Design a protein around this ligand. Structure first.
Ligand SMILES: Cc1cc2nc3c(=O)[nH]c(=O)nc-3n(C[C@H](O)[C@H](O)[C@H](O)COP(=O)(O)OP(=O)(O)OC[C@H]3O[C@@H](n4cnc5c(N)ncnc54)[C@H](O)[C@@H]3O)c2cc1C
Ligand SMILES: NC(=O)C1=CN([C@@H]2O[C@H](COP(=O)(O)OP(=O)(O)OC[C@H]3O[C@@H](n4cnc5c(N)ncnc54)[C@H](OP(=O)(O)O)[C@@H]3O)[C@@H](O)[C@H]2O)C=CC1
Ligand SMILES: [Ca+2]
Ligand SMILES: [Ca+2]
Lengths: 143, 93, 234, 7
């Protein structure tokens, strides 16, 4: 493999969710890539530390289709497998119209609602998280 | 613009756990750490004490390690504000 | 040998190398990174320094060459290679270019194919798209999964009724209507058929643990411990 | 309980 030139972190990574006991992390479109690292760091922090002020994390992923972000499904799978304190609750919202579904979206739909799970995990992805189809109800969820 | 930036930040309000009148005119203040207060070594904060009726903010280096539960400051008696702070924190209650 | 691969007017051509296995043909980048592998089972050619090999099921493979002699040598070798296990035309460069269906046109055809399939599960272009068979690689890519994945292999082998290595519209429609409108007993039967690799009517403990790991050694065995036929699995 | 139900 060729060698890379790396310019260090420019993020200036506010971690304000640690300031709150309960936090809701909302990701949309391409603005969901950092949440993989965020969730992995959160689950590691809650695994190594006991009295973490952040008692519960809600990760609301909102996307049209999971194309180019299928790796995020595996990352969420490993995060929920390593979530030994039920810190992270993941909710995926596929907002694609039913007529414009691709093969992956239809497979997700049928495995979520037209096919029984095995260990409460969908046969397609393997996530204990529930995947929804439509606009996420932010107001009723917050209520 | 600098005044507006300063106003943008929200100043937390905390209580002092312990006050020590260390010799050579030094005041050691241990006070409650804010819930979301995360800092690195060598960083400094600003403090104000309304007991002097001044609302004046002065910078002081955090002498406490980030792994601790409370924040500590070692304030030297340099002038009016520091001397008044030492005098007010000399007595309990 | 070296050649140039054309992927449409918009997409630039790239230098590739062609290898001829006894039954398979490999188009592999000069870095030795495999790009395409095609299998011949008992194809047409178009000549122009342009050689258009028309794949009946997948997108056509067209090659450009520095000289006509190199193309002639390649076609002479390929005729013997394919005859070991055949029609040729003489067309112009523009005619050969327009007679090929590239990757982008295949993607559009698959898009309308999936559109009609999902519309049915819940006209010239429609008929042309519906008369196409999806390869395993295309099926995996449309699923968003790797070609060598347990779910894609299980579903592709289970859905391939004739087992020709390609998935047609009819099989996909039947399996999708089974998934959507099938009875719970029928859904359990479909899951049982997809779970067993050998398909001998029973699930082995090792095979059941393999299916569990597919869903994702001692831990899996302990989980399985707490054969199993159709009724037992249900 | 959480009211997670898309529109
Ligand atoms: C980044 C930083 C960190 C510091 N950390 C500490 C600490 O951990 N412990 C400690 O004892 N002292 C510290 N100081 C010293 C700081 O100046 C004190 O707040 C100061 O001694 C208070 O002076 P006074 O108003 O009581 O007396 P003054 O009579 O005002 O003191 C006169 C001197 O104090 C300085 N000074 C006064 N007010 C301010 C202000 N608002 N900002 C900057 N400088 C001022 C002036 O430069 C002057 O030289 C720090 C200063 C800086 C800039
Ligand atoms: N932090 C940031 O500043 C970020 C900015 N962006 C910007 O957003 C732009 C578009 O992002 P893109 O990559 O296309 O993401 P997408 O639009 O592909 O996905 C975003 C998701 O949010 C939903 N959504 C989008 N717009 C609205 C809206 N107005 N109201 C309600 N729901 C909405 C979409 O559902 P549906 O389409 O079904 O309505 C979609 O599922 C980009 O130009 C990018 O610059 C993106 C990510 C992070
Ligand atoms: Ca077939
Ligand atoms: Ca079997």
């Amino acid at each position: 493999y060729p060698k890379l030139y790396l310019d260090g972190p420019f993020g200036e990574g506010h971690q304000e969710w640690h300031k709150f006991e309960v936090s809701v992390l909302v990701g949309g479109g391409i603005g969901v890539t950092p949440f993989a690292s965020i969730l992995k760091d959160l689950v590691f922090k809650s695994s190594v530390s006991c009295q973490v002020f952040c008692k519960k994390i809600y990760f609301i992923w909102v996307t049209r289709t999971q194309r180019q972000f299928e790796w995020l499904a595996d990352i969420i799978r490993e995060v929920e497998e390593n979530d030994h304190q039920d810190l992270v609750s993941v909710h995926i919202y596929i907002t694609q119209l039913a007529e414009k579904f691709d093969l992956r979206t239809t497979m997700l739909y049928i495995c979520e609602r037209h096919f029984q799970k095995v260990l409460n995990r969908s046969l397609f992805t393997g996530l204990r998280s529930i995947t929804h189809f439509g606009r996420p109800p932010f107001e009723p969820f917050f209520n | 613009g600098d005044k507006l930036v300063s106003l943008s930040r929200k100043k937390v309000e905390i209580s002092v756990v312990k006050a020590e009148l260390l010799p050579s005119g030094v005041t050691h203040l241990r006070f409650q750490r804010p819930q979301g207060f995360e800092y690195k070594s060598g960083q400094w904060v600003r403090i104000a004490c309304l007991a002097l009726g001044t609302t004046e903010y002065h910078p002081f280096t955090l002498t406490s390690a980030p792994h601790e539960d409370t924040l500590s400051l070692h304030i030297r008696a340099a002038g009016p504000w520091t001397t008044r702070l030492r005098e007010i924190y000399s007595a309990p209650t | 040998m070296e050649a140039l691969e054309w992927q449409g007017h918009k997409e630039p051509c790239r230098p590739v190398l062609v290898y001829l296995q006894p039954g398979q043909i490999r188009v592999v980048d000069g870095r030795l990174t495999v790009l395409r592998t095609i299998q011949l089972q008992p194809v047409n050619f178009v000549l122009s320094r342009t050689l258009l090999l028309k794949i009946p099921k997948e997108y056509d493979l067209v090659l450009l060459f520095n000289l006509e002699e190199e193309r002639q040598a390649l076609v002479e070798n390929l005729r013997g290679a394919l005859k070991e296990s055949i029609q040729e035309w003489e067309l112009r460069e523009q005619e050969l270019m327009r007679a090929a269906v590239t990757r982008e046109q295949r993607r559009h055809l698959l898009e309308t194919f999936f559109r009609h399939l999902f519309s049915q599960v819940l006209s010239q272009k429609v008929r042309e798209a519906l008369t196409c068979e999806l390869s395993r690689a295309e099926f995996a890519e449309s699923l968003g999964l790797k070609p060598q994945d347990m779910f894609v292999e299980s579903m592709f082998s289970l859905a391939d009724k004739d087992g020709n290595g390609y998935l047609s519209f009819r099989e996909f429609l039947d399996i999708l209507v089974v998934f959507m409108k099938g009875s719970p007993e029928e859904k359990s039967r479909l899951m049982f058929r997809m779970y067993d690799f050998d398909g001998n009517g029973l699930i082995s403990k090792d095979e059941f643990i393999r299916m569990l790991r597919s869903f994702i050694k001692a831990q899996l065995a302990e989980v399985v411990e707490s054969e199993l036929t159709w009724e037992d699995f249900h | 309980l959480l009211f997670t139900e898309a529109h």
